Amino acid sequence: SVAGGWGPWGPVSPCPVTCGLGQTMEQRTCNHPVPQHGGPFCAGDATRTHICNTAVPCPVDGEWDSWGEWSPCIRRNMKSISCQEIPGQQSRGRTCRGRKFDGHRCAGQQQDIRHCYSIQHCPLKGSWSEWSTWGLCMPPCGPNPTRARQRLCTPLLPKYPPTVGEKNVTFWGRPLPRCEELQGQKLVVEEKRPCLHVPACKDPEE
Amino acid sequence: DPVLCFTQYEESSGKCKGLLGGGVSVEDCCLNTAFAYQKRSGGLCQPCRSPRWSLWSTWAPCSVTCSEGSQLRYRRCVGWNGQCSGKVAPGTLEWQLQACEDQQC
Ligand SMILES: *[C@@H]1O[C@@H](C)[C@@H](O)[C@@H](O[C@@H]2O[C@H](CO)[C@@H](O)[C@H](O)[C@H]2O)[C@@H]1O
Ligand SMILES: *[C@H]1O[C@H](CO)[C@@H](O)[C@H](O)[C@@H]1O
Ligand SMILES: *[C@H]1O[C@H](CO)[C@@H](O)[C@H](O)[C@@H]1O
Ligand SMILES: *[C@H]1O[C@H](CO)[C@@H](O)[C@H](O)[C@@H]1O
Ligand SMILES: *[C@H]1O[C@H](CO)[C@@H](O)[C@H](O)[C@@H]1O
Ligand SMILES: *[C@H]1O[C@H](CO)[C@@H](O)[C@H](O)[C@@H]1O
Ligand SMILES: *[C@H]1O[C@H](CO)[C@@H](O)[C@H](O)[C@@H]1O
Ligand SMILES: *[C@H]1O[C@H](CO)[C@@H](O)[C@H](O)[C@@H]1O
Ligand SMILES: *[C@H]1O[C@H](CO)[C@@H](O)[C@H](O)[C@@H]1O
Ligand SMILES: *[C@@H]1O[C@@H](C)[C@@H](O)[C@@H](O)[C@@H]1O
Ligand code: NA
């Protein structure tokens, strides 16, 4: 009897998000005229979508950076504990980065604390390590890729108690290990060799 | 330069998902740091979150079929509005080259 027809596009609905971009739309209805006694419904789209900008930035939650370096091993009210069987303490921190527009602060510990022994600048007896495994080829994209392994004068650490409220005590600091000369070196012996049949570094998106 | 804006970024794959559409700046897309964008031409999907290194790719296969060769892998500074380790810009690749031998040949 009567074929459906679309009415006019209505107004744009309010943006459904409270920050950044969203999808809004305008709608129309098959009522101009409404279908009657078996007449067809309207062909095509009842909806037409748009991107809407709120122009408002969303909150950004903070995120922990990685731990900073351990502070020096020291004991409150002792001038110097290095090269001595005297536990100290040290701490390291990390920063909540990127927190913005009322985003969440980070959850968890900001500061890390432990007992240490100081062997900072402490001369120790060393023995030579076996070869390391071959390192990476350097430079990986430059013209001369060469890989290396090394033997190191390894310090012999003092037989101090590992724990001492019974808590772990960690050696900290760069000692000065004393070795027999090996191939004219007192600390590091290095081997190099070229990497063979070197590929070219190509951005996989190019 | 207008981009394609996605509602979702997939960390594991680094894929853009849930296209909002085009005709938007990165600036507007990334008002929501949960969003991701792509150039109209295609290629690298960038998340709107702050820049951080991607995981190393698996090792690419041995430059030679049975002799000693080498093989590459990479990671990328991926994100927006900042820099990765070593004052580095989003999109920047870092490469590692490993010595390689496929079979005892
Ligand atoms: C409405 O007000 C805004 C200031 C935000 O707080 C909105 O929350 C945000 O909602 C979007 C979804 O559109 C999420 O992606 C954001 O992560 C969330 O912060 C709030 O709905
Ligand atoms: C509504 O949609 C289009 C007009 O824009 C046509 O398919 C027909 O007028 C329909 O009822
Ligand atoms: C809605 O869209 C356009 C105008 O926005 C016209 O073709 C007509 O008004 C339609 O109903
Ligand atoms: C600090 O703690 C360890 C490394 O000591 C890791 O979980 C990570 O680097 C964190 O920032
Ligand atoms: C402190 O502990 C050791 C050095 O003794 C390393 O894991 C790192 O330097 C950390 O900050
Ligand atoms: C160096 O280390 C010890 C002695 O310092 C020995 O295993 C050997 O001399 C090595 O070359
Ligand atoms: C390194 O070189 C070989 C092993 O590759 C041996 O002579 C020994 O392990 C040395 O440390
Ligand atoms: C370097 O050479 C061989 C072959 O890659 C390695 O397997 C080994 O670890 C050495 O350091
Ligand atoms: C690549 O290097 C190692 C694993 O091979 C990890 O530190 C991490 O997966 C990184 O992205
Ligand atoms: C690649 O396959 C290996 C097994 C060797 O036969 C090579 O010579 C060949 O090119
Ligand atoms: Na000490």
Author numbering:
A (entry chain A): 255 to 418, 425 to 466
B (entry chain B): 28 to 132
Lines from the paper:
Properdin is the only known intrinsic positive regulator of the complement system. Properdin stabilizes C3bBb, increasing the half-life of the enzyme complex 5- to 10-fold. Properdin forms seven domains, an N-terminal domain of unknown fold, followed by six thrombospondin type I repeats (TSR) domains. Oligomeric full-length properdin consists of ring-shaped vertices, formed by N- and C-terminal domains of separate protomers.
IMAC-affinity purification yielded stable protein complexes consistent with one-to-one non-covalent complexes of PN1 with P456 and PN12 with P456, denoted PN1/456 and PN12/456, respectively. Both PN1/456 and PN12/456 yielded monodisperse peaks during size-exclusion chromatography (SEC) consistent with a single monomerized species, whereas recombinant full-length properdin produced a SEC spectrum with multiple peaks consistent with a mixture of dimeric, trimeric, and tetrameric properdin. In the absence of properdin, ~75% of the C3bBbdgf‡ was dissociated into C3b and Bbdgf‡ after 1 h at 37°C, whereas in the presence of PN1/456 or PN12/456 dissociation of C3bBbdgf‡ was reduced to ~20–25%, indicating that PN1/456 and PN12/456 stabilized C3 convertase to a similar extent. However, our construct PN1 is terminated at Cys132. As a consequence, we observed a non-native disulphide bond between Cys93-Cys132 and increased disorder at the C-terminal end of TSR1 in the structure of PN1/456 and PN1/456-CTC; however, the overall fold of TSR1 was not affected. The crystal structures of PN1/456 and PN12/456, obtained by co-expression of N- and C-terminal parts, clearly revealed that the ring-shaped vertices are formed by two contact interfaces between N-terminal domains of one protomer and the C-terminal domains of another protomer. The structures of PN1/456 and PN12/456 showed that the properdin vertex consists of the STB domain, TSR1, part of TSR4, TSR5, and TSR6 domains. These domains form a ring-like structure through interfaces formed by the STB and TSR1 domains with TSR4 and TSR6, respectively. The distal part of TSR4 is held in place by interaction with the STB domain, but the proximal part, where the short Trp-ladder, comprising Trp260 and Trp263 in strand A, Arg282 in strand B and Arg302 in strand C, is located is at a different position in each of the three structures resulting in a distance of 28.3 Å between the Cα atoms of TSR4 Ser255 in PN1/456 and PN12/456. In all structures, the O-fucosylation of TSR4 is especially well-defined and is involved in properdin oligomerization. The refined model of PN1/456 taken from PN1/456-CTC was used in molecular replacement to solve the structures of PN1/456 and PN12/456.
